[PDB]
Design an enzyme around this catalytic site. Structure first.
Site, PDB file in Angstrom:
ATOM      1  N   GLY C  59      11.924  -3.772   6.571  1.00 29.84           N
ATOM      2  CA  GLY C  59      12.604  -4.519   7.630  1.00 29.84           C
ATOM      3  C   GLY C  59      14.086  -4.648   7.328  1.00 29.84           C
ATOM      4  N   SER C  88      10.332   1.180   2.399  1.00 32.78           N
ATOM      5  CA  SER C  88      11.697   0.877   2.712  1.00 32.78           C
ATOM      6  C   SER C  88      12.125  -0.327   1.870  1.00 32.78           C
ATOM      7  CB  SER C  88      11.872   0.692   4.200  1.00 32.78           C
ATOM      8  OG  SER C  88      11.284   1.797   4.851  1.00 32.78           O
ATOM      9  N   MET C  89      12.621  -1.389   2.503  1.00 28.66           N
ATOM     10  CA  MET C  89      13.087  -2.533   1.777  1.00 28.66           C
ATOM     11  C   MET C  89      11.942  -3.160   0.975  1.00 28.66           C
ATOM     12  SD  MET C  89      16.139  -3.425   1.402  1.00 28.66           S
ATOM     13  CE  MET C  89      16.864  -4.786   0.499  1.00 28.66           C
ATOM     14  N   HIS C 113      13.300   5.626   1.638  1.00 33.73           N
ATOM     15  CA  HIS C 113      14.084   6.331   2.626  1.00 33.73           C
ATOM     16  C   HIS C 113      15.446   5.629   2.770  1.00 33.73           C
ATOM     17  CE1 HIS C 113      12.512   4.255   6.673  1.00 33.73           C
ATOM     18  NE2 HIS C 113      13.297   3.437   5.950  1.00 33.73           N
ATOM     19  N   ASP C 162      11.960  10.276   4.833  1.00 38.62           N
ATOM     20  CA  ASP C 162      10.810   9.523   4.410  1.00 38.62           C
ATOM     21  C   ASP C 162      10.128  10.268   3.249  1.00 38.62           C
ATOM     22  OD1 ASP C 162      11.311   7.862   6.570  1.00 38.62           O
ATOM     23  OD2 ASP C 162       9.324   8.179   7.529  1.00 38.62           O
TER      24      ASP C 162
END
Lengths: 182, 6, 182, 182, 182, 184, 181, 182, 182, 183, 181, 183, 6, 6, 6, 6, 6, 6
Positions: C59, C88-89, C113, C162
């Site tokens: 997010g 991700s985060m 990513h 990704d």
């Protein structure tokens, strides 16, 4: 309304080490189930847990959060399919302690390949395709270990939606027993 | 998830 | 419904044992809650480990950095455990746990990513937004280099698209220290 | 939102230790809550510091000024700590903390820019709206000049477009006093 | 909305000290709550001051008059404090506080303007609606004249369009008695 | 949020002193609550006055009549106080308070008008709906005549279109008995 | 349908009549401008007749028409039927002096320009300055065309101001009320 | 659209006399039509002037350059006449007319500003989009410098925000050669 | 589809000086009818025109464009109501040459007061109300002149929707004759 | 409105009389069907005279694009390509497909090259089929673009990984066009 | 509001071993009913349970979760139809302990074949069709066992919506008695 | 806009030379037009070849069979030429051309797969719909077997999922006779 | 806000 | 965040 | 509309 | 618009 | 565009 | 569901 006993009914069942998976599997549901499993292990690391499954499946990653937690904790987790265990739901049914996976006689079990999506550049579609194919290999391998069926047979039998009776699920190795009534 | 986390 | 144990909701019961569940998308609300939990736990006991369980698609980067900076600031070690998925985060926060105390369960997925965003308006406005997100990426890559031992150049290449890792691959990469085996 | 055990939601538990969390957009509801918290804390103890944690993209300027004026009015020092992001009216409130007690965490972002708004209708109505937002900007710039030590002319130039600062740059600018290192 | 510890939401805790928060648009629900609070406070103690904090863009004129008439009816003095913004019916209520006890914080905005409405249908129906809103405006202007010391003619001219005042200008106008300085 | 006093929400605290707040549109839910409150208060004490505060744009006529008939049925006097606005069925209920005990605050608005409705379908269906709303209007007008002292003919004329009254005009009309003035 | 005789409007254009019977936008302006240029090219000396029934619209589209009227050699008569509002009333007033007419029950309405602005304070400032300059330009020209002062035009257009044909004549927006034989 | 009588719509009748009307937003359809008209007119007569009437708020830059490049390519001089408004790419085309033959009517408006656009996705994608629109702006500014005689530095400053010019100001600037007086 | 004769059917009728008003009255319809009336007068200034009316009414100003054109031109305009003439439709029916206003036996005529709307400031509502009341006075005055009924009676009879038979419309003075079949 | 010229022709039909085809939109099946029909008509009228394809297009359907491409290569006449405004994606592919020596861009025209775009939703096996298909489509595009430009397949692959905007002059240097048409 | 007794009213009934199925049958409802049945058996394995049914039916698999739980537990489950038992609702009514299935006199019972849907490839439609036909065979077989009617008769009588009175439901073998006042 | 040649729209001009363009989804409207064109051309000349150009993602099976049956019924040979793409019922019609006279351009795509549909309602209704689409598939496979020379069993396997063929692969499969290569 | 309100 | 805030 | 327009 | 355009 | 295209 | 679960 969810009825109260003097606890809401689900919380009352959790007191006797029963977890109800009665919905689609998403991150919220997985987080709750994982938390329940950890809580029950902390209360008593030796007594069985009972996971009741009526679920059309859902997120594979959410499903694996539950799966890995089941295998990690010390207590045996019994699985009981009531109504339906489809897709990731049938995977979790098969994940119960060996000898302690059950379905009620009119329960439906369905197995199939994972679903997903990919949009964008060719390279992006390639990455997404490789990811979901790896996910399917991982599911098939574990299902092979849990059922005794070959990876090749799992691959063929999940190519399309494959509906099993409780008795067929037992023959397949997804469950150990059909729970017949006294 | 213990040991060791708790 | 989230079950109750005895009166705590299950997540509050886990928080009593210094366990924080990050089981959703990271936005400002979630970060505010997690930050508050971390601060509360440090105030209760500045020496005992905290456990951050991560099942998250990621997010907001700034929300993520609120959590990241709080983890590094407080005195207690924060252990990180990936269940299901850290993307991700989410994978950035997994890597941010105390060195030696970053874990993933065996079937958990880790994805890395580059940051995503948007820009609309005049050329000059687009330039400002581009410069901002490129600086944000440099900052993420630098920290990820420090936390993994990989070079900045390799992080840049490996996050261009990704990039999905198994738990074992995440360990080899330096994102986690151990695969938590049953 | 988790509960801790007196039974407090986590934010209420932090408020007991004089911590206020501004973790969202600034609107009238949020301002009313923050103002109420500040007044409550002053009434409890007119001498002890308050801590205002800011992770906010900004929002309503008038709502922001309700908070600003309350901070300046009350006797206790209000420390400001930026985690994640303080943008627009969020960065204005960060700069409004007691001199010597304005902080940002190392990876926190601060953004300053001119106020935003809108007007539709007759030429004379548009004129009134334009005059109003230009006066609002003058007021913000004047106060920001007083709080940072930068000239009004420099503030005007530096807020013409979105201007993103690192924590260290925010310190150099005079928006904060210290980068809070771990 | 945070809790303080008897366990009170923050607004209820302020109401215990005779503080009423008008922090939203004025509609029938808000008016009913404020009226009820004023009556409750008078019943508890008919002599001690009440404090009405106002951050409001205005709203329903009739809802506003429910509050206004209740303020004038009860025995206790009602002090008014504008934080952030008091616009339209909000600025009318600010001016309605006990003489000598109407305040605004230094960066608060006060806005006065004519009432807004609408009418659809037959010429005769539009005539009735027009006459009604013009009478409503006369009533507001008359009372505002009495409360400020400005002539009806001046109020009419100064409210023809949106008219934004600083706190200091609101004091000069007679809408408030003092700017509450830090 | 509705504030709490000490544990009562503010409206429940007022109900303890026999005050009922009608502060919204009149629908079946609101009527059911008000009726229940009136019955409860009568059961607690059949002799002490009840106070009905009205700030309402009106609403359902049948819901309004549930309240009206309950007011007239119970033994206690029900005082009515208009704050803000009493329009349509709201002004009807204001007028329904115990004679001598109907009040409005000085800047309160009272509005009277004819009932509103709708009908769609066959000519015969439209006829039935028209006859029904005309009978409803006759019933309202007759009762309003009894409660105000105005003739039926005058009520009919004065409600043909939206008719806005000041508190003082409402008193002159016979909808209320007194304008509640501030002591100060 | 629009009837055929030529569609009816094209048949009128053959006799140098232009019908402005709608909101003024860029499309309408482009058509009217093209018609004016065509008619001048056909005959640089004969009068053109512009019939106006319009609630107004785009000021810039309106100025395309206005400037074309003033540029071409032929006199352009204006006749208001029904309504000329906003930029429509501006164009009515733009007809050749002595040759601006309204029918007796026609309505003329004058008011200030409408618009919008969104974004940064500086952007709102630019938009405000632009629409205020536009209003100054309209008021100046309307002063020249009517004989009214700029100050009076400013006051009289602050809100919607509806005029009868007779009042429009007194104001200087038209020269005559066209009465029936 | 009226017809004139061979039966021509009014625009086709003007095209017979070498007049092209650009009376709308510039998009691909409009550019394709204008380009086709220019090529047709050159083929009909390579020596006689073409007249391009412009009343346009602008639009697509690439569509605009299709028209621009066609104007510069063909043998006949293209006169440009601004009626109403020439904004953005509309004002660029106005300035692109044959030197000495660029006109505006006296109450026509000319507006110049920087190009507008949008970008969504990965950091790298935003960078590419930003670089592209910055190059586009440099190209527009360079040509506008050549066509007006103003320096590139001045064009850059004067197009930073919306810049509205009268016909007379456009002439002084070098965007047109003459104000066409009656 | 509109049929063709060897003209579309309406154009064929226009050749015999018949105009069909068979819709709502808006600016487009008025512009067409006005153009037809002007064309017919130019063809022959002495021969009668026939305006057939089947219309629920519409725009008052559009209606007055037609009305004023009828009164201006030299030829008599006969009006024939077929089906329905309501509101501005019945006004135009009454506007035909005296002695030459007809309705077919089962035609409906309806008269009522004008409809409209207003939204905004009290002052704006006042202006709109005054405008529609003046419009009604104008309609009533002309209808008084055309019917021979007093203004006071017209006012009363148009307060609400008032439906007339053809025979009643004749008695009222809206038409001269009911056109009965041979 | 599209203007008429005077035989009464809409402007595009008048250009088609001089062997000019306008590709001024997104490429879909309808546009391809029209362009293909025009190319076949022009060849039938005269199998030896050049055709001129003017391109201002953001691209679109790859298969629709290949209908046009294969028709260009099949017919006897040389098809000159002229980029005005923009040739992106399949639009730039068609620009490069013109007769060698007769591919042009106007000086301010933009040319953009990138990899094909698409989508797939459903079963893993369905996603696999879609992925394989779009990757084969990309190989086919890259191979032809290699032949048409003289650049290696490896370089084309790298240069189309993301949106790559070229000036007319850069498109010439790349081998996508032969000349910049200077005034 | 659901009223309170001093328990919400449903919880107060559950204390006396009464379960209310008063809605559409979905997974949530089935999970609640199953949990209630298990709780009641654990409290007392010998005392009767009472399942009140007013339901238009719903999910067949959710219905089978309830059905299988009823047959599994030791206590007898009485079924009482109030209002309506349709589709899977009527199946559950018939699933009560033999001799202890009731309907109130004006209650409606409806039986019909299962409903569903399928979209996609021919082979996918085939799989979906085979699945719902197997589901119908399973329902019909059990309903044959519970009513005493032949499978062939059940098939014919459920081909379309078939509405029964309480008395007809008794004659059919879906219930044992009409509960008279 | 569809251009005009001189007065024919471009498609009508091609129809004069016995060319029919199928450049869209196949629905009832398109089938009715194509059928009408085939009948018109046969009436004009019962001996000269017709040319059917196909760029189509497919569509309605029954609409497709209206075209198919009309092709087989009329006396003239109907040549089929795939440009761009022939998918689903589009590839079925490509294969339906006169033997020896079915072509694809070199970069054209051909796709074969099983029919798609839907069914909602009672079990018995779903059964009827399932039986119907399975019969439809048997009918398509049988005819495709006859037209390609492939066995029914092989067609069944090869159409289970989306199966994309190059022009050359379509020739090897028997869907076309020749890849039309450029001079 | 005391003094003096409270 | 103490020391020193709290 | 003449006299005088036309 | 002539003189001079046309 | 001739010469040379046409 | 006991025996045997619970």
């Amino acid at each position: 309304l969810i009825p109260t006993v003097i606890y809401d009914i689900y919380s009352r069942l959790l007191k006797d080490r029963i977890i109800m998976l009665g919905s689609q599997i998403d991150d919220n549901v997985a987080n709750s189930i994982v938390s329940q499993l950890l809580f029950l292990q902390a209360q008593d690391s030796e007594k069985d847990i009972y996971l009741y499954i009526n679920s059309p499946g859902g997120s594979v990653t959410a499903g694996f959060a539950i799966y890995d937690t089941i295998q990690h904790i010390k207590p045996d987790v019994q699985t009981i399919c009531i109504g339906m265990a489809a897709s990731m739901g049938s995977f979790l049914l098969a994940a119960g302690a060996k000898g302690k996976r059950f379905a009620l006689p009119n329960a439906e079990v369905m197995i199939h390949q994972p679903l997903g999506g990919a949009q964008g550049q060719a390279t992006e579609i390639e990455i997404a395709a490789n990811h979901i194919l790896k996910t399917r290999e991982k599911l098939n391998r574990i299902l092979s270990e849990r059922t005794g069926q070959s990876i090749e047979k799992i691959q063929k039998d999940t190519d399309r939606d494959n509906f099993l009776t409780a008795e067929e699920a037992k023959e397949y190795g997804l469950i150990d027993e059909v729970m017949v009534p006294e | 998830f213990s040991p060791x986390a708790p």
